[PDB]
Design a protein around this ligand. Structure first.
Ligand SMILES: Nc1ncnc2c1ncn2[C@@H]1O[C@H](COP(=O)(O)CP(=O)(O)O)[C@@H](O)[C@H]1O
Ligand SMILES: Nc1ncnc2c1ncn2[C@@H]1O[C@H](COP(=O)(O)CP(=O)(O)O)[C@@H](O)[C@H]1O
Ligand SMILES: [Ca+2]
Ligand SMILES: [Ca+2]
Ligand code: NA
Ligand code: NA
Ligand SMILES: [Zn+2]
Ligand SMILES: [Zn+2]
Ligand SMILES: [Zn+2]
Ligand SMILES: [Zn+2]
Lengths: 524, 524
């Protein structure tokens, strides 16, 4: 039998440096995890031990820390090249800076193939981008070859900034002819590597004939066989076995996010490329694995420009930015309005004639606003200032919530009002009125929301059965601050851009800001 | 006796081309007026006839039409040079593009001295600007000399964008030592030429010893002796005679605005420079005076770039911009919100630690909004589109109004509601609630206004005795649409930037706009 070791990462999201256990800034180095220097050590060890190894990335290296803000993907090409990745699939966040911000730096500087079989281009863009990403690549491994076929979320236009040329086709529709073509070319071992989420990965494994293994991403899915090694709770076994329409057992793998784990799957193939067995588990990249000294020194050199950038003026405020708890946990505060306005601006995506924008609404836990910003330093705002306001390393995510769920969230926002607790919500595109003399659970007396399916945005009463798109912190989408109804009742959840980066980009665009308290939240 | 003819303009405000009678776009050429080509004809005729002539401008050539938007003052230098102006005083609007936008093009390209004795600079700016404007200039006229001493409104920091280096000193304090210095230099004929308004001009004439004549501007003051030749109603005789503290009769002149009139004052001096007599009148530059063919051909050449600019994309909207009368004369409309937000943005000026901005409030007659803009032309907005919304050639001015006056204005806004009349007000920085079941004059049931003397902008109830700064159309400041209370009760009025230009600059800054209807105006 011919044995292949697949090493894989996904949704690394700019975690070039080692992180804390929750993937935020590393504080106590002796307990930090991940980072490319530590990944290098582990990949190198495995490559000494196993003859046939592929190192694959399932997309979403772009977006997540100041590394991406400053280097804009050059850091991804550089450090993925240093790790000698064998292939990468395009994720949604690879389009965050447009097709131009993908072509340069990433596609032109990567030394490995970058893959997606379900993205097509038209017009001059088609000639400009031709061959810079590929539907698949056939790679030599030892004396054999392995075909790797890529895919990218069909929902990317709602989750990034790909522009209006590119078309994202249905994954299974695009993948099947490519896999059948590879069979006709005597390629009998085929990995589907792509960025659509665990649920789509399972459908691909079931329905795309000829796929031997699916290596996925997007949903930050943690899979494990046995007692998990850290705090992440598995969604299923590793690999997750799908029975294909033609009776084969097809392993599906993912490796959480943020570079905390290295996926590791061993597959045994027979001479005809049939899978005999598959087993493995993600490896927790904890501090027992040393950071490679040379990669670490390179990381530290690249960090200089990040430190320099962090104190540069992004823009100016002419108003005090009130991010105090005494305001933001008790009433509408202008820092909350600013952040929610930045959240909505970040989520402006190309729209049909059916909506002015696909999302208009924002909620933000006031306890997640951690500092004011004083305007008396010549109005200057720096990244360092914003990192004091938003220190948790979160993202501003997109969810779909029924109106009934959102109303329950606003009741939860004030269910124990008066104690300076974090669940009090700041808002955008929502006007709420509370009557605190009513019983907890019945304190929301008016709740109006900004329309999306309208050419002139205006407010209408919230409807209990209607499903609304809302931008909110990952922390809330995951049920933080007691918002269990959000986690349990949401209909869709996609991870968005880094919290600081969302606000920094908006301030830079606006140049001079003056957010007011304007009646988004009132008390009767 | 030595006779001097003073020809003078002020507040031309970018009216390079001939205009209609009300100084807007020329439509029926046979009845149009003003423009530099016609001015050239008349100045040339007078210079053939009178031996001792000075042609003076009292400031505010900058700002008013697409000419300034595109050429940014190069048109002022070019055409004032062609007319051979002898001197110009700096007005407030010469600072609209900052000191940088004054130095280049105007100060470096004018072939005549540009004057202001009450503006001082510090730091590197002082070395950069030294000598490019002057406190005064002594000019030879025939066999005599005449000193011209300049001044500029002390209020310029609130009425333009001069920056924080320059200091505008009290006019009389700065002028007196310069005039006394000229006396010691054997200059016995002295004109004060400046840009502070008719009231300050009268104080200068009264109190600055040695000033023989004051040539002013800023307040668009029309003075005339006899039956006026057009629709402007005189504020007093021409010249307006002030008796100085030392007993002399000092003529004060101004010549309205917009290039419609050429001021013309004849002064007889004795051998010691005492004024024996003064008489004259502004000359209406009507169609009986031919436009100079060569200046006109030059104007038409320069117009090509304006026509080209007028169809270029300024920015994008992703929402329909509802400037329909059915919306904007009946309720809050998003085009009204956009325009008022642009008005407030245009009036962001440097502020003490005593206010976040000196003005926060805006009113706009809905009848002054003349078209929607459809978003389905790839979202594009052009100057031509904005000129359809705002076709009247107005300005967005700064006034001071007591709260009682503003409340009366909002009652007037709905006093005959339901007839699609123009007085219905769109707003910014004001939240109003009407109850139309109440009697006219008693329909405003809530009126809250955005604070200025606050570090965090928020709304408070309007106070009847407090004086508020408000940005509103010139048309309303002058009592249009029946707002006689505004004209009669306002405490301060200064002319602002061109209406289209205010909106165009804001759209260009924002890049992508999406104004909502958000509850600034409600009905109970
Ligand atoms: N990861 C996180 N992301 C966003 N908000 C968070 C996160 N962790 C905690 N918070 C916020 O921080 C609040 C707790 O704040 P404090 O009362 O100041 C106590 P402390 O900061 O010591 O936890 C929570 O209620 C929540 O709103
Ligand atoms: N110079 C102006 N500046 C601003 N608004 C003006 C001016 N002249 C007229 N308007 C507006 O135009 C309105 C009249 O509009 P319509 O009912 O459409 C009749 P018409 O346009 O024929 O005068 C006035 O009530 C006022 O709001
Ligand atoms: Ca196979
Ligand atoms: Ca004299
Ligand atoms: Na999924
Ligand atoms: Na005046
Ligand atoms: Zn991701
Ligand atoms: Zn993703
Ligand atoms: Zn003026
Ligand atoms: Zn002026």
């Amino acid at each position: 039998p011919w044995e292949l070791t697949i090493l894989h990462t996904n949704d690394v999201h700019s975690r070039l440096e080692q992180t804390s256990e929750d993937s935020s800034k590393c504080v106590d180095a002796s307990r930090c995890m991940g980072g490319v220097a530590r990944l290098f050590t582990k990949v190198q060890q495995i490559r000494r031990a196993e003859p046939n190894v592929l190192l694959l990335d399932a997309g979403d290296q772009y977006q997540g820390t100041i590394w991406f803000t400053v280097y804009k993907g050059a850091e991804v090409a550089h450090f993925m090249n240093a790790l000698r990745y064998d292939a990468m699939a395009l994720g949604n966040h690879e389009f965050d800076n447009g097709v131009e911000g993908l072509i340069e730096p990433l596609l032109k500087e990567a030394k490995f193939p970058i893959l997606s079989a379900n993205i097509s281009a038209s017009g001059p863009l088609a000639s400009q981008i031709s061959g810079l990403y590929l539907p698949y690549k056939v790679l030599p491994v030892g004396d054999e070859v392995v075909g790797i076929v890529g895919y990218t979320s069909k929902e990317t236009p709602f989750l990034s900034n790909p522009g209006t040329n590119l078309v994202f086709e249905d994954e299974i529709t695009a993948l099947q002819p490519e896999v059948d073509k590879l069979k006709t070319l005597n390629v009998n071992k085929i990995i589907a590597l792509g960025h659509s989420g665990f649920e789509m990965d399972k459908l691909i494994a079931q329905k795309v004939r000829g796929v031997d293994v699916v290596v996925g991403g997007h949903s930050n899915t943690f899979l494990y066989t046995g007692n998990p090694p850290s705090k992440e709770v598995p969604a299923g076994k590793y690999p997750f076995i799908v029975t294909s329409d033609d009776g084969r057992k097809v392993p599906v793998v993912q490796a959480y996010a943020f570079g905390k784990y290295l996926g590791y799957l061993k597959i045994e193939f027979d001479e005809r490329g049939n899978v005999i067995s598959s087993h493995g588990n993600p490896i927790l990249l904890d501090s027992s694995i040393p950071e490679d000294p040379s990669i670490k020194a390179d990381i530290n050199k690249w960090r200089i420009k990040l430190d320099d950038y962090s104190t540069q003026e992004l823009g100016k405020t002419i108003v005090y930015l009130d991010g105090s708890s005494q305001s933001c946990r008790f009433r509408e505060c202008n820092m909350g309005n600013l952040i929610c306005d930045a959240m909505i601006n970040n989520n402006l995506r190309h729209a049909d004639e059916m909506f002015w924008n696909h999302v208009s609404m924002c909620i933000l836990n006031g306890g997640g606003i951690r500092s004011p910003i004083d305007e008396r330093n010549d109005g200057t705002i720096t990244w360092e200032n914003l990192a004091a306001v938003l220190p948790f390393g979160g993202t501003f995510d997109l969810v779909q919530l029924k109106g009934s769920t959102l109303k329950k969230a606003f009741e939860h926002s004030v269910h124990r009002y008066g104690q300076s607790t974090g669940e009090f919500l700041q808002v955008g595109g929502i006007h709420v009125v509370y009557d605190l003399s009513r019983k907890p659970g019945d304190r929301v007396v008016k709740l109006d929301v900004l329309c999306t399916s309208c050419r002139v945005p205006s407010y209408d009463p919230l409807k209990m059965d209607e499903v609304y798109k809302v931008i909110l912190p990952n922390f809330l989408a995951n049920g933080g601050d007691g918002f269990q109804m959000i986690k349990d009742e949401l209909l869709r959840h996609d991870s968005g851009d880094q919290d600081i980066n969302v606000v920094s980009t908006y301030i830079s665009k606006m140049k001079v800001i003056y957010p007011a308290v304007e009646g988004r939240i009132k008390f009767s």
